[PDB]
Amino acid sequence: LELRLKSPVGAEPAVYPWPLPVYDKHHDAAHEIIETIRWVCEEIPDLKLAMENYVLIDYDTKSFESMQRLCDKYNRAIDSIHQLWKGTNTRPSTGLLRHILQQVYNHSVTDPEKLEPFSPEVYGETSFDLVAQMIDEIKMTDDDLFVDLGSGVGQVVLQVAAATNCKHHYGVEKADIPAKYAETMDREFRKWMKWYGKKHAEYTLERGDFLSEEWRERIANTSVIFVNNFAFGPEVDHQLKERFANMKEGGRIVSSKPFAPLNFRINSRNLSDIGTIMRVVELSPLKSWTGKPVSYYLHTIDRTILENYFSSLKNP
Numbered sequence: 589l590e591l592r593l594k595s596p597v598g599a600e601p602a603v604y605p606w607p608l609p610v611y612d613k614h615h616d617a618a619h620e621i622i623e624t625i626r627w628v629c630e631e632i633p634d635l636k637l638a639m640e641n642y643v644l645i646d647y648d649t650k651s652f653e654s655m656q657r658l659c660d661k662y663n664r665a666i667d668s669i670h671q672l673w674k675g676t677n678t679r680p681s682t683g684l685l686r687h688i689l690q691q692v693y694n695h696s697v698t699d700p701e702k703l704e705p706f707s708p709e710v711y712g713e714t715s716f717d718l719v720a721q722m723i724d725e726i727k728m729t730d731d732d733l734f735v736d737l738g739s740g741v742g743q744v745v746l747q748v749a750a751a752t753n754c755k756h757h758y759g760v761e762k763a764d765i766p767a768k769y770a771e772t773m774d775r776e777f778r779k780w781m782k783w784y785g786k787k788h789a790e791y792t793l794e795r796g797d798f799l800s801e802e803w804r805e806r807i808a809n810t811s812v813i814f815v816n817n818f819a820f821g822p823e824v825d826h827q828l829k830e831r832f833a834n835m836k837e838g839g840r841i842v843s844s845k846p847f848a849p850l851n852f853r854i855n856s857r858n859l860s861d862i863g864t865i866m867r868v869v870e871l872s873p874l875k876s877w878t879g880k881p882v883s884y885y886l887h888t889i890d891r892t893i894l895e896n897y898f899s900s901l902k903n904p
């Protein structure tokens with residue numbers, strides 16, 4: 589009939605129907621169950637001690653009785669640990685977070701006929717580790733407001749919210765299918781994070797056009813913008829540079845293609861270019877990274893670039 593996994597923190601149990609749902613070509617719900625148990629065991633050393641060793645070695649993913657036995661062994665072990673704590677919320681580790689995001693996606697994007705080499709289906713394979721590097725480089729604080737422009741199903745927002753302490757994390761998506769899927773991703777993320785007893789910052793996944801009037805002031809008041817501008821046309825890029833021109837000093841933009849040349853040299857013929865008000869650096873996880881040789885671009889609002897040019901004109 590069904591398989592149930594009791595929460596290590598006493599939240600509502602995770603309930604899976606039998607036959608288990610089929611996921612994409614290289615994922616199945618039976619492995620998700622086993623890896624969930626394994627992650628909770630890393631999380632609680634007492635749980636690994638109490639749980640019967642063999643259970644996580646000798647199993648049949650295609651057998652209801654075998655999967656039920658595995659779940660029952662884990663559930664009984666959770667009960668023993670909960671009894672031990674009678675007699676007497678942190679951020680997830682990077683590894684647990686990759687598992688949680690995968691789990692959230694699988695429960696949200698059922699039959700992925702809807703929605704490329706960098707698709708939501710493969711987020712965990714290169715984008716996750718790269719976003720983890722961007723998070724470590726940026727070092728956001730409680731004073732920061734974070735926005736992912738074109739958030740898709742919301743994977744980057746969820747990862748940043750689980751990793752940082754920004755006052756708020758926003759994801760804005762214009763397309764109908766991804767935005768609709770983001771609503772389930774949001775529900776599933778909140779539910780699973782509660783199940784593991786893991787903390788995350790506040791976040792909102794919204795449907796909208798980041799080039800709208802409403803979003804002009806919102807971009808101007810964001811301290812950290814993430815934007816996958818890789819496929820942006822010249823008009824989106826031009827409009828986006830105009831939005832960025834209203835940002836505060838020290839405002840940061842992390843993107844897949846630079847918005848200004850890395851070697852921008854202010855002169856009399858380029859005073860209208862975004863390069864006059866922003867520093868740009870190419871960051872690469874390769875410079876102990878073993879993934880794809882991929883770069884990201886960090887832009888920092890700095891109007892002193894423009895101020896020095898005028899100062900140099902007046903005081904040669």
Ligand SMILES: CNc1ccnc(Nc2ccc3cc(C)n(-c4cc(-c5c(C)ccn(C)c5=O)cnc4Cl)c3c2)n1
Binds near residue numbers: 715736740844884
């Ligand atoms: C990627 N998924 C999502 C989903 C929702 N939001 C974001 N936001 C976001 C914001 C800032 C950056 C900067 C980079 C480097 N990436 C980045 C780029 C690419 C990529 C490459 C290198 C080449 C071609 N294409 C088409 C690509 O997508 C792959 N993965 C990442 Cl993590 C970003 C992603 N990304």
Ligand SMILES: [K+]
Binds near residue numbers: 636637640
């Ligand atoms: K044991």
